[PDB]
């Protein structure tokens, strides 16, 4: 500190407090860069930051220091948030200063206090910073490289601000989106469910109410399909993509499958449908996405995603390895009877895992005791040892996640909300924060 | 006390955990079953309910895997069934157990409070609901801790 002061205050050459380094960083930027999220780190950066501002306002009051952008277009705050320097971003959010010249510097001002009671007011730059960046926007769609991205919403200015929107306008917006999506699903399924049996589709339209209704559905479903593809492309392009943020990919993939099916149908291939069957299945499961913004259900969906890739993925590899090895061992074993085919033996071997295992399915093998030994070993290591192991490991992912999986759900609502307003046409919308408070402390 | 506290867990378990697993299960099973009905031209596995019931068995432990011949593009039908089983029979059923393991850990102290509450409500009602018949209506507790 003392040397910071002597640099800025000396008679011989006062430091230019706003100079930028090769990267565009000022002292406030550099301080953000030097944070490492340890408690004593935050503490020292935080108040040296404070100190710089106090000196800025004392010595050169006209200078709006915070607002100065580094090469990449980032204010100190926005850098903090781009690099998961949360303690410091939080400090900036919570800044309050009271002294002559205090008001320009401060982030939070408190106005109403009753013997009980307290009120906090927030600026707030992050929510309304359309022109360059928003704190929420930087946090809401982070790199996922960054050491600390999930944690950040929790801070009081952003987390409360997000909850506040949902009650006022946004949740009502989300439900209509969910409801609108649901109808699209009933229609895709309905045409598919009722699609004509007779070959060489598409057969010419019948002069019937049923033909009229089904045809509208088929057109509607494809049209429904285009919307995702168009929205999807924007995320790849607009989102500056880029296996993260999977739900968007799933939405894109299901639509793509629907599109390919349409290309096949006009081609007039019988199989267009297998594309259609895949497209229908992908859609209903994607309904699982719409759960978010329901707190109990949405948090639950996060566990399913978390569970699936790491735990399910791990069990899948070994399962494929074991099942493949043993199935091959069996095919060699049997001369004839269609249990020779590797796929056929492998499918029979799978049933043991499902709960449908046949044990001794096939007679036409030689040296019979060996075949049974092969099957018992596969079951012991693989049906019991694995399936029971998978449950315990799942029990582990569940214990570690839940607090983490609450953060992820919170993040998901934020991303959905942030996008709709941006993705809502940036239509007129709010753009003062304060929290009613009452803790004594008195 | 042992049985009553146990019953509280069943109630606690049922609505929140069972209810949550039920929604996704209905969603998955419905989607895949619909995908299957489209797939099959004839043979009574076309009916949505019939296909759906056949799809359910996979969850029970009775799943037939390839139940029906009369479908076209056969590899796709099997792919549909394998995916449904992997995400839905294994991933879900095993997930439900772990989540149940969670409700159980959080509850138990809470589920003792609930049982205690239930006896109180039963007792309070019978005396009120007992005709407010003549009944007691001094408290002191024998104590001995030193503290000396």
UniProtKB/Swiss-Prot annotation, chain A:
Phosphorylation by CAMKII seems to regulate binding to vanilloids. Phosphorylated and modulated by PRKCE, PRKCM and probably PRKCZ. Dephosphorylation by calcineurin seems to lead to receptor desensitization and phosphorylation by CAMKII recovers activity. Its main location: membrane. The keyword Iron does not apply. Channel activity is activated via the interaction with PIRT and phosphatidylinositol 4,5-bisphosphate (PIP2). Both PIRT and PIP2 are required to activate channel activity. The channel is sensitized by ATP binding. Repeated stimulation with capsaicin gives rise to progressively smaller responses, due to desensitization. This desensitization is triggered by the influx of calcium ions and is inhibited by elevated ATP levels. Ca(2+) and CALM displace ATP from its binding site and trigger a conformation change that leads to a closed, desensitized channel. One of its GO terms (molecular function) is identical protein binding. Resiniferatoxin binds at residues 246-247, 285, 292. ANK repeats lie at residues 25-61, 75-98, 133-155. A motif (Selectivity filter) lies at residues 355-358. The modification Phosphoserine is found at residue 242. It comes from the Eukaryota. It is a multi-pass membrane protein. The chain crosses the membrane at residues 173-193, 212-237, 246-266, 271-291, 307-334, 370-398. Residues 396-424 are annotated as: AD. Residues 194-211, 267-270, 362-369 are extracellular. Homotetramer. Interacts with PIRT. May also form a heteromeric channel with TRPV3. Interacts with CALM, PRKCM and CSK. Interacts with PRKCG and NTRK1, probably by forming a trimeric complex. Interacts with the Scolopendra mutilans RhTx toxin. Interacts with the spider Tau-theraphotoxin-Hs1a. Interacts with TMEM100. Interacts with PACS2. Non-selective calcium permeant cation channel involved in detection of noxious chemical and thermal stimuli. Seems to mediate proton influx and may be involved in intracellular acidosis in nociceptive neurons. Involved in mediation of inflammatory pain and hyperalgesia. Sensitized by a phosphatidylinositol second messenger system activated by receptor tyrosine kinases, which involves PKC isozymes and PCL. Activation by vanilloids, like capsaicin, and temperatures higher than 42 degrees Celsius. The association domain (AD) is necessary for self-association. This is Transient receptor potential cation channel subfamily V member 1. It comes from Rattus norvegicus (Rat).
